[PDB]
Design a protein around this nucleic acid. Sequence first.
RNA 1: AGCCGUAGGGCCCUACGGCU
RNA 2: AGCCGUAGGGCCCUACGGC
Lengths: 670, 670
Amino acid sequence: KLADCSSKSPEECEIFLVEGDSAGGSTKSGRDSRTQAILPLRGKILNVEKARLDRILNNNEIRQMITAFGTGIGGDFDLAKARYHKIVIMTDADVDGAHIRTLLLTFFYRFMRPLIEAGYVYIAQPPTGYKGLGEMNADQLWETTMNPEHRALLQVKLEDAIEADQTFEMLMGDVVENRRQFIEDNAVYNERNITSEMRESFLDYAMSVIVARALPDVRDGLKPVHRRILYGLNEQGMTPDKSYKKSARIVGDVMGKYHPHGDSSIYEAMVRMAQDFSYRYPLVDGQGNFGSMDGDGAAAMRFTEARMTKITLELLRDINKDTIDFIDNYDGNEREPSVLPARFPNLLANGASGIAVGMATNIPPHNLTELINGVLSLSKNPDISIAELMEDIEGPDFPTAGLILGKSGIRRAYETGRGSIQMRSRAVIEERGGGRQRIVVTEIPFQVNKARMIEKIAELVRDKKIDGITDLRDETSLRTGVRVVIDVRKDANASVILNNLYKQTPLQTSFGVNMIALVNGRPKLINLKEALVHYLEHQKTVVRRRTQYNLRKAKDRAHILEGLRIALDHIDEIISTIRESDTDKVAMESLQQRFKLSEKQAQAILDMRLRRLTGLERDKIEAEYNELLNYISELETILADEEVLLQLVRDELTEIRDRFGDDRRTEIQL
Amino acid sequence: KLADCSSKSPEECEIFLVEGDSAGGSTKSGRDSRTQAILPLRGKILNVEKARLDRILNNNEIRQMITAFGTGIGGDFDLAKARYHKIVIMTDADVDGAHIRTLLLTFFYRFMRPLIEAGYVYIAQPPTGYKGLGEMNADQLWETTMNPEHRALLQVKLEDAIEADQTFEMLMGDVVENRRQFIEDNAVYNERNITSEMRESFLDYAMSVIVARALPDVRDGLKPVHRRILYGLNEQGMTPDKSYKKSARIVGDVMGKYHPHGDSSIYEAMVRMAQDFSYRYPLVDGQGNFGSMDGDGAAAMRFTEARMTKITLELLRDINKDTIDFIDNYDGNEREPSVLPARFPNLLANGASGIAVGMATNIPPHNLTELINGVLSLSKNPDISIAELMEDIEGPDFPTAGLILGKSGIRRAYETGRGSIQMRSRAVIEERGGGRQRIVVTEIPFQVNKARMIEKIAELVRDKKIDGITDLRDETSLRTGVRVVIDVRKDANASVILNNLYKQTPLQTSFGVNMIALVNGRPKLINLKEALVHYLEHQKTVVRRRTQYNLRKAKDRAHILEGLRIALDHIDEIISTIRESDTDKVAMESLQQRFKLSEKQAQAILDMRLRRLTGLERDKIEAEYNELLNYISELETILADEEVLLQLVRDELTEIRDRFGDDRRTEIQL
RNA sequence: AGCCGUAGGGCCCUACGGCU
RNA sequence: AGCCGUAGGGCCCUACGGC
Ligand SMILES: O=C1COc2ccc(CN[C@]34CC[C@](C[C@]5(O)Cn6c(=O)ccc7ncc(F)c5c76)(CC3)OC4)nc2N1
Ligand SMILES: [Mn+2]
Ligand SMILES: [Mn+2]
């Protein structure tokens, strides 16, 4: 895949390392084919500091780079054989391109150390605000990054090798804690030194993954991709009353406007939100093949269609009533929400699963009715214990139902944010004829792949690791629901076979609770009370801001009426004033001075259509004015009393509990 | 890839053959897993009538069907070893689904005939307008086509065995003329016989590819995909004055609204429209990596950006002025143009190429100044000969320039619609020093891969197929342009080496002209005059319709201004009437009666804002009316005389020729 | 192990006609 | 023989943390 240069003189020859063919093309078009060679990689390169030699040497990209440089690796390294005196790292001008840069430096430091020592390793500086080099025109890439007469390359420099080994060990190694400690210690919410570069690039990547990718916000329970999808459907009015909309139109729109990442990242996030076995309260309503519990993926996006579910309307309720802060998108062309109003506690209701850098999050879904009664209880007692909260919130409530073994794990997770929860399958022992029996499984644990579990059981039988099993079939149908049958050998104790299946297969699975979520844009391990407290404050803020909006909005309307009232009373003198005016400006000025009107009032009059001059309009204006004055009072009453505001939040949460609250699916066996 | 059923009694067992995994997933979810198995294929299967036996037996999808059926092929076929007593073909409910069915039937007929004889082969009947089965929910696919209670299956019956043998060789064989004749003769503009199925399904497909895919319309020179891309850019304001819009937004929009096919087909058609080496007059203006002359493809659609070129504004000019006919899109939720106004001769300016069924198209690009001059000469003389047109139209004009050898092939092509055009590269012989020489190539033939051409020269040198070549280099760059160097051995005759390169390499390429375009939605082999006659007809129609639309609209606006003028003249009376009326209906009824106004006139007065009563606004109304009366008079002139209409078409083509007309690139050599 | 879910990145089989 | 351009269809490597 190497697009080598014509020359054979390494001293004048250069090799550019790009992320793939999309960047490679632009680079191949702009380059000097005489002295500049191109090697397109394939995205994220292997982390050699975490991988063993067998994996390193059987890797396609690693192999290709060694063959391109001709020096060999490690012990057998020979700088004389170097085919290029310039190895230039030209990854994309984004957080993931910085990660691939740290990955390439890691491989040059552990396998090609004298290449850095000779100053042969350089870092290209393409301009920011592109998605990739593939977004650049050939001419723009030459002049800014490739022309030796105008480019600015950073030559990689190695100073203290003890400091370098420690940095590559800390940032790239297998020990997560030291990496987590570096993020905590450093995170703030032409030649280059290899240590400073690794630390800066890796920190940009880690901070980006943590605050803007893998972890959900504590207020709305969403990760950036999900929030962008829901905001996307909302903006294009893809509400439940409207028809389904083409998946590609949704994905295309969201990619261009809010999410500058791969289509598959966007589309798979939309798919999961539509899966009744993934989401306890699904956020997307899908039409077509959206996958199954057997690991089957969704159909290609050209076949599927989607829209919002009714509960999603509750997450987006009052978004245009200045309840949430808006921010600029990635390119400054659009505005996006920083958080959603979230009228129901979505973090805990739907849960979250995220693998970040230096940490991970594993939050289980819960029952909406239980959560809401918990929030209601907390609003009535700020000093409520986790034990009192557990009277309302019994434990997680998986979409796939099943069983949880005791309150011990649950209790530990709700008090510390960490705990192991044993999930069991719903399995019964029934007779099948002729004095024979069978095990019937109708509920499997959360996130357990049904077909994969069936194969692990078959494996255990074929490899003689389990006694008593004659046959196993999957009888699942849309009619019957999940139905896995395991036939027992006549006279064999089916209960013994079942307990052996719980201990040796995904029939019994564990859920490692690790409640990490963003609190004030920062990752934080929180407990059940902390999570509810942050959600309750978000509601109080959203409701306060909605009331403040309406009040400003109602006071502006009342002021417009005061003026329209004045216009209808002095209609003939108003018309006369406009008629005798040469321009709009003169008319504005004259109406203001004569009738004691403001700029807005005069503008409202000038905008008034002739049909507003009808008989039942002065009565209409006065009817609206009076009702508005009542409404202004209702709003001022809420803002004056914090207890009234708090009751308003409770009332609205109670409506949501009655409209959306369903029964518990998962049995917590004591 | 087989998703087998629980049962092992073939007599009750059914095997469903689907297009791929998107359809497969809906099928796996909706089925009865006990008696129904699924075999997801991978799109179009091999054509066993045109393929050599060795290719058939090593083909992955063919192997998978034989393995699944467990019968064996041809002579080693055993109906006793049949794993299912029902082989159900369930392709998508579209033209390509019909093709895959004809492809499947052919393999069953030539390799597993007793399977048809036993009445084991069936045809499922999924509901029409979905794109794929993956667009449907499992329960919908179960009830409509998979449930034995409600389904309507067609059992394939083989009646006449001589008729079937002859049918399969006609539709699926290598002899095109038999297939072309069948299309021509048959084109129109529960048991089932295998011959009737093959004929209907093949005609479905063949017809679709001919009128709705592979052939350009004679009027706008576009194929459905190109037309839908350009219309998509117009309906999204993706004009040259505006900024580049993301390719993914364009793709998703076009696919969802007008083109029900793969995104690779839409994106690749848009890409080609943006390449200056493919389009004589590029239709798309691309930002980023849009591919090269070396066969390099464009960047993934998430990286690229695009908009209309200035020339495309001329293809779409006045589309929203009732110039062309709109039709319903594929699903009856959108409107799409049937043809574009096409203010310049696009078919001949950009050319076309497309492989259809029973026929193909191959039209070369031409120079815009020459084409317009040709149309102008034709407008002044309906009886003009091809030889006289050839005074204006010298011949094709490739974007990649080069040379054409003689007028003989050109003359034949313009007179019959068919001819062989000999194209040559622009190659010179020059000195390089020390008595030695080289061949410099600076222009290569049209649609020739530069890199592949170099490798062809390289392999001739290596395998000693050519003599005298010491070196071969691509010295091309953005700066220099195309530059290929072939170093000659000292004292060797370079012109001899050159003539040899022209005989043995793509350095000399023929262009087989085959002018097949859609004339009245029917494919026709047309010559030069016919192509321009149909273009001119279309322009006369567009400009007339535009004038007729502009007259209706101006007459509707003068009418509304007549009403507002009456109101400005009797303002106090108008106000009185509105003020006295209790409702908007009573006001409208009174104004119509009191001032002899129409319903439209009265509504316009009621909609009038107070700001229209000022001096400047009062004058605007009068000036617009006076401007409009002159415009109506100018429009009526155009419609009174046909020579004035034709002069307008001529003056509009002269404007376009002066603005877009450029120099000829391809040299026509005697 | 290798899986979970957001991210980086690309490749190859088929049909169809007319030219070589 | 195999390329040209709209069409049908889908796979597999990489990072990252916890168990
Ligand atoms: O924003 C929008 C709007 O409109 C759209 C409609 C449809 C689509 C889906 N298109 C695709 C789907 C898979 C794809 C990558 C792919 O080609 C698939 N694939 C395989 O299935 C198997 C092997 C393989 N090996 C290399 C390779 F590059 C690819 C492979 C190619 C097209 O990447 C994106 N995307 C958009 N995006
Ligand atoms: Mn990138
Ligand atoms: Mn299909």
